[PDB]
Design a binder for this molecule. Sequence first.
Ligand SMILES: *OP(=O)(O)OP(=O)(O)OC[C@H]1O[C@@H](N2CN(C)c3c2[nH]c(N(C)C)nc3=O)[C@H](O)[C@@H]1O
Lengths: 109, 210, 139, 1013
Amino acid sequence: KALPIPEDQPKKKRAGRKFRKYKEKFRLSHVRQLQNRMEFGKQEQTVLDSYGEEVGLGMSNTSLQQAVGATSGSRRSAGNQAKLTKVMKHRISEANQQADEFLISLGHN
Amino acid sequence: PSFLDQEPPAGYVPGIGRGATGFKTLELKLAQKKKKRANEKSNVKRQFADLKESLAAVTESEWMDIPDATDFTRRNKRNRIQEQLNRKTYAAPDSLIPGNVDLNKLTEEREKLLQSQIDENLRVNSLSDATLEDLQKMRTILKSYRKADPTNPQGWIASARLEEKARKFSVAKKIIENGCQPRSSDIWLENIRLHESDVHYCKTLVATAI
Amino acid sequence: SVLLPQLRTGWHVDQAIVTETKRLVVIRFGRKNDRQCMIMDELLSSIAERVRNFAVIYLCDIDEVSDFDEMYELTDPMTVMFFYHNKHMMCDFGTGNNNKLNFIVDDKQEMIDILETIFRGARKNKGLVVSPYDYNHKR
Amino acid sequence: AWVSAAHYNRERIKRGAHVEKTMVKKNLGRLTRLWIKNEQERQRQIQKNGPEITPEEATTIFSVMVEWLESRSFSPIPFPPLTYKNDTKILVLALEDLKDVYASKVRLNASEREELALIEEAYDNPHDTLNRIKKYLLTQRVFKPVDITMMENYQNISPVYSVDPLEKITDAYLDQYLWYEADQRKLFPNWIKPSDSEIPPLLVYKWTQGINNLSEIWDVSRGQSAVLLETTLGEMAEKIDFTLLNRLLRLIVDPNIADYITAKNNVVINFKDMSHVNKYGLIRGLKFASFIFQYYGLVIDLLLLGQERATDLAGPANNPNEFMQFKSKEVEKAHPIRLYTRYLDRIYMLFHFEEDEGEELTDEYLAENPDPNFENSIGYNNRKCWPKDSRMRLIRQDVNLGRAVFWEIQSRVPTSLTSIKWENAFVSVYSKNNPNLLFSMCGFEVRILPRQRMEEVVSNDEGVWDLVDERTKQRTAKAYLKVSEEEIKKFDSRIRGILMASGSTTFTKVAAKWNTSLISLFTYFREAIVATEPLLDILVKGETRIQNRVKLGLNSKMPTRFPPAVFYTPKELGGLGMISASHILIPASDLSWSKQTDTGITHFRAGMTHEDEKLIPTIFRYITTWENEFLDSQRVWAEYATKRQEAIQQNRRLAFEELEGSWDRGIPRISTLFQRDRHTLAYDRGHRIRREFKQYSLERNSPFWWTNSHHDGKLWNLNAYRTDVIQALGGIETILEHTLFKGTGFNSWEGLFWEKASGFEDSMQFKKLTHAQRTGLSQIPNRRFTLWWSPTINRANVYVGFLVQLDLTGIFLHGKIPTLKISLIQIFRAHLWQKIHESIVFDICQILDGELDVLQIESVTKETVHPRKSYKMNSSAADITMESVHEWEVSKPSLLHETNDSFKGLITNKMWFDVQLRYGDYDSHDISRYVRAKFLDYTTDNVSMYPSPTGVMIGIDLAYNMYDAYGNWFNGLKPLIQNSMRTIMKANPALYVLRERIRKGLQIYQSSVQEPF
RNA sequence: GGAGGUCAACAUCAAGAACUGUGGGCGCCUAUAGAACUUAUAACGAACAUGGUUCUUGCCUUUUACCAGAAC
RNA sequence: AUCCUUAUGCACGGGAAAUACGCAUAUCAGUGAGGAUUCGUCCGAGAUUGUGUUUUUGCUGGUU
RNA sequence: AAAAAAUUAAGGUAUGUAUU
Ligand SMILES: *OP(=O)(O)OP(=O)(O)OC[C@H]1O[C@@H](N2CN(C)c3c2[nH]c(N(C)C)nc3=O)[C@H](O)[C@@H]1O
C-alpha cells in the first residue's frame, strides 16, 4: 500500500466555535508556551521530576512568584484535558454498574 | 512497461538522442609478462544442489496447483492497528506542570468528596531556591512601596512577611524593628513573633506596644 | 530481485527515462556478481512498491550496456542515478560527490526519505537538494 | 546464521567496539526474540514434567514459615473493608505514583492519554472507583494479555511488562495496601533490606561499622577466622511456583487477595507475533510484585539461618532489635553466623569460626569431596580490582574454609526454590594468613584492614573511612572503596548509548544527557571515583567523545581548537552547559573583550597577569564526601532532638529560625520534617523497593533510583558550579564577545529572553508531516547554535583551510560549515549588503550637504558606484568628495576619539570618504587596527582610485556594531562625525533590517508583559 | 676445440636417510613427482623494501595516508 | 371527542465526540456471533478478512 | 658563554534562464 505523494496541498482554513474546541487538544496552550521561554542570563526554575531529571519551567512563573516561590495557578485551559476513548468509556461505566449490583447483594445478604 | 517489451532501436547512439550531458607490441609484451605469473602462481550450492536434482521429478500440473500467498502471522492486520495507534499525539494537559501538588490539600479535598458521595448514596522541595537577581527585584519593589508611604504599616509588615518567606533571618528582623519606629499595634504583634526566640528579648519587645 | 525489471539495451535506458513524466526514474548501474550491487538490489526491491506512486525503478548492468560509462563516468561496483524530466538530478549526501550515489544505504526508512526529498525538491526545478542524513563519514 | 550472528554482535557491543548505528538497533530485536523463544521452551517443558517441587520437598519449606509466623505471633492481613479509614490516603498515593510518569511531558502518546484520563476519573469519583477495585479483587480472575518489551542496557537485555490500565489501578491500590499493612504488623524483620530508612550507600556504611563493632572479630591471636558470602540467589522470581505461592500468601493474607495475586500472574504474554501463557515464573511488571519477592525471600532466609538463629537476629516481637544489634555478647557468639542481610537477591552472611569449630567444617567437606591434586583453588574467584597485596590470598587452610562454608549453605536451600551456584558467589576469608576482608555492596568494592595488622603494605586512598568502635572510640579499622567493575562498564556503555542512539538530535540534547549521566555517577559514588583509576580514565575519554560529535556536525573537517567557552557556558547564555570532569585550558588569548562607549573604544585583557592560569572548574569540589554527610547527620539529628525537647519543655513549638541554620544537612534532611505533605507520606511505605522495580514496568533509564526526593530531600546542589564556570570564562562580558550578541543591536541584556528550541519542535509536530519533513525540523535547533556562536567558530585559527566569499557579501568562510552558509545567506537577501553601504553614504551626504556653510564648502558630491564595490575587499575607491572655499588645514592622519589635534601640518585642498563594511570574527573585532591598515594600503596602492591624496576611511562592524575612522582633520569634523555616527548607527533603516533579521535567526526577544492584551 | 663474453632462449634452485607411483637399463641401479622427519631457515642474497587478508594496540568512528606487535 | 404507550419520519432548542466514521460481485453467523460464571448454571448479536478518510468535509468574512 | 621545530593530505562544487 502506497505512500501518497510528497506534493504539498494548499492549506485550508476554518474555525468556528466547534472547530476551535476540537483543535484545542493539539496546540500548546498559553501556559504551556511560557515554558519555552528561557529568560536570559539567569537560571531557570527547575523542579526535579519523579525520575529526578529536572524540568525547566521557564517563564511560567512571574519574577515575583520566583522569589516567593509561590507557583502560579494562572489560567488553566480545560480544553486539552485528557478524556476516555469510546471503547474504554463504557467498559468503565459497565464495570461500575455491574459492581453496584454486587455490593447490594452483600447489603441484603 | 510498454517500451520494455518492444526490442528495436534505430541504429542510434544512446547519449545523443535523449540530449545527453556528462555532468601493439608493448601490449603483447605486457600480456606475456602477466602470463609468466599466472603460470607461476559454492558450499551453499553443494549443500543444496543435491536437493535441486531431487526436485527434477515434479510434474507440471503440480507446479501449477501450488497455493500462492499464505500469511501465518496476520502481519498485515497487526501492522495496521499499530499505525493507527501511533498516528497523532495530543497535547498534555496543563494540570501537569510539575509545581503545584500538595498532598494535604489533595486528601482533604478528596476524602470529603468521597464522604459526600457515600452520604448521597445513603512550595515544592523539587523547586530551585530563589535566584539572587530575582530576589533583588522583589526587594526594590517593596522598598518603593515603603518609601511611598512612610506611614501605613501595611506596607511595612508585607516587606517583613514577603521577605520572611523568601529569605528571613537577618533581613526581615531588622526591617520589622526599623518600621516599628509608635501607634500601630500590628507592627508590634508582628515584631515579637519573628524576633523574640528568647524570653528577655520577647519581654523587651512587649514593653514596646505597652 | 526478480521483482524489479532490467534494462537490456542502452535504448531501453533512454526511452525509460523519457516516457515517465510524473515520477523519478531511479537506476542502479552495476553488475550482477558484485557484493555491493546485490545488496542494493535488495534494499531497493523491498522499497519499490511503497514508492510506486512517485518513483519508478530499473536495473542496468555496466557489462550489458557500456555505452554510458564515459559520459556519466561510472566507477566502482554501482551508482544510483536519479532522473526527472530528462534532467539528471543531484544531491549532496555529505560524501563529496554530488552526482549520483555510491555507498550502500543502511535502513529502508532512510532510503525512502532520500527518494522523497529528491522528488519534492525536484518537482520545484531545484537542481540540488540536501539529503537530511549526511553519510560523509560512512563513505 | 541468524542466531549465531546475533550472539556474536552482542559481545562485540559489550566490549565497546564500534559496530555501527543500525546493527545495535536490530540486535536488540533479535535478542528479544531469542529470549522469548527460551521462555516459551521453559514453559512447555513444565507441562510435560510437572512442577519440580516434589511433595516431600514442599512440607519442609511450608513448615518453616508456619513456625516462624506463629513464633512471631503474626495476625494475618485482612481484606480491605468497604468502610476503611485510610482508603483516601492510599488511593492518592497510589494514583500519583502512577501519574508521575507523565509529569515531564509536553505531549502524550495516544495510549498515555487514555491512562491519564483514567486517573482523573479516579479522583473525580473516588467512591465509585474504590468499589470497582474492591469488586475486581473479590471476583475478576480473567485478565487481559500483557505485552513484553525489551530494554537495552547494552549489556543486560531485560524485560519490561506493560499491563492494561484498569488493571493497573487495582494492582497499585493492592500494592500500597499490602505494604502499609504489612509493615504496620511487622512482618518483615530487620535483615531484609533495600528498606525504607537507609540509602544504599548509607547501608554500606552501616554494614561495615556493624562488622567492626562485633566483639573480637579481628584478633587472630588464637587461630580464629571469619568469612563473607555474596550469593546471587539466582533464578528466584523466574522459579517461583504458584501452587506453593497461593498457600504461603494464604498464611499471611486473606484468601480472596491471595487468589487474585496468583491469578494475575498467569496472563498471556504477547510480544508481537509470539504468545505464551505464564504458568511457572513470576512476572515482575505488576505492582505488588515487590511484596511477593520479599515474602519469598523470607522463606529462603529462614532456611539459611534457621528459627533458632533467626530469632536471635530479629529479636522478640515485643522489642525487635535495630538493624545490626543483639541484646548480649552471648547471644552473638552462639552460632557461626553473626550478621546477615539480603538485598533483593544477593545475600551477605558473616561467619565467625574458631579452629575447634573451624577444623570440623573444613574436614567434613574434604571427606565428601576429596581433592588430592589441590584443585580447590583453580576455580576460586578473587576480586580482580585490587592489587595482589590486597586481594584474597590463596592458602590451603583458607581456600578449604571458603569451599566448606559455601558447601554448607548449598545444602540448606533445595534446588527447587532457587539455584545457588559457586560461580556467582564470592567468598573472603580473614585469618592469620589474610589481612583483608573483602566484599561488594551495591557497586562498591570494600576492603577493610584493621589497624592491628596494618603493617602489611598500605597507601591511603580518597575513599577511606575510619571506623570507630562504640567503646574504645578509636580507629581500629580502615575502609577503602572502589567502584565495582560492573558499574564502570555500565557507564561506558551508557555513554556510547548517547552517541549511538542519536542519528539526529540537537547538540543541546546530547549535552543534556551527559549531564544527567555524569551527575548520577558522581553523586552515588562520591568518594570512590577519585580512588578508581580506570573509571577516571573513561570520564576524560567520554567528554572528548561528546565534543567530537558536536564538532563533526558543525563542520566535517575538525578544528585545532574550539574555545572552551562554547561547551561550558550555561544554557541561558547560549551554551551547551555541559559539566566537566577533566582538566581544560582556557587559553588566556581567548579572554579578550572589547566594549564601546561614546567616549571611545576600550579593551580588556587579563592575559598579562601571570599567575596560575584559568581552568574550568570540575565536579570534584562541589559534592561533599559521603563520610561528612553521615558524620553531620548524627550530630544534626541529635541537635534537632534537643531543640524539639526544648520548645515543648517551654511549652513552645520549634521555630524555623533555629533550624534555618541547618536545612541542607542530614541524609533525610531537616526540610522534610517541615514539608506540608509529610502527614500523608507516612502511609507510603516500601517506597524504596518500588523504585527499584520501576525498571520492569516502563522503559526509561532512571538514573536516580536510590532516592525519592519527597522522602529524602535534595541530596546535591550544583548551583555553586554554574557561577564558577561563568567566572572562569571571565564573566558574561568575556563570553558574549564570542557571540553575535552585539550584532543584535541590543544595548543591554536585562530584559531579554530566548525562545527555547525544545518546545519549538513541538509546535511543528502538531501538523501532519512526512518523515523527511519531520527530520528536517530536528535540525533547526542546531542552526541557531551556530549563529549565536558563529563568530568564534569561524576564524582562521580554528579551521585553517582556505577563505571564500559569499557571493554578494563581505563575509568569509573558513570551512564549508553547511549550516552557517545558509543562515548568513538568508540574513543577507536582496543584496542587503549593498544597501547598507548606500544608506550609510546617504547619511553622511545629508549630514554634510546641509553643512556646506558652517564648514565653508563649495560642493558635496556623492560619486558613481561600480555596483560591486561595496562587497569586494582588496581594492577600494572613493565615494563622497569634499571641497573648500579656499583650502584646508590637514593634520597627521589619526583616529576619531583622540584628543590632541594640530592643524598646522599642511594646507591643502579637497577631501574624500570611504565607508567600509566589515563583518569581523573574534580574532579581530577591533577595527582600529584594520581601518588604519586598510587606509594606508589604499592611499599608497597604485590600483586604488582616489580624487586627492587626502581622505577619511570609515570602518563599520556589522557584527559587533563597532565604528571608527582614521581621518585627515579640519576644524569641525571630529566634533561633527562623533555626534553624527551616534545617530547614524542608532537609526538607519538598512541596519535595522539586519538587526531585526538576525534576531529572528537567534529567536531572541524582549518583553515587559507576557499576559495577552 | 678452449677461454670470455653484462648476449639472449628454456628449465630448475638448500642438503640428507627412509615410503609410494611412473619410465629406462641389466631383485639391483639411475631420473622425475608427492608425503613425513632432521639441520639452525649457515646464508639460493653475510643484502633487505612495499602491498593484501585476519587478528590484536591508538584513533574523526572517515582515505589514494598511518602508529607497532602477531600469524597467513 | 379528549388523554396515554411504544416504534418510525421531518424539526425548533440544548449537549458530547471524530481514534472516529463508513465501504466490499467477500467469508461465516439464533439451524447460535461473542462473552460471564458463586461451577449449579447465566447473558444472546455480531465476529472475522481487505480496504477509504481521520491534528480534519464543504462554505463564507476580515485584515496584508 | 644557558634556547625552533618531528609532521601530511580528500569528506569545500548554488540553483535557474539566456548566449556561444
Ligand atoms: O373530530 P370529528 O368530529 O371530525 O370526528 P369525525 O367527524 O371524523 O366522526 C366520527 C368519529 O368521531 C370520533 N368520536 C367523536 N366523538 C364525539 C367520540 C368519538 N369516538 C368516541 N369513542 C369511539 C370512544 N367517543 C366519542 O365521544 C370517532 O372516531 C368517530 O369515528
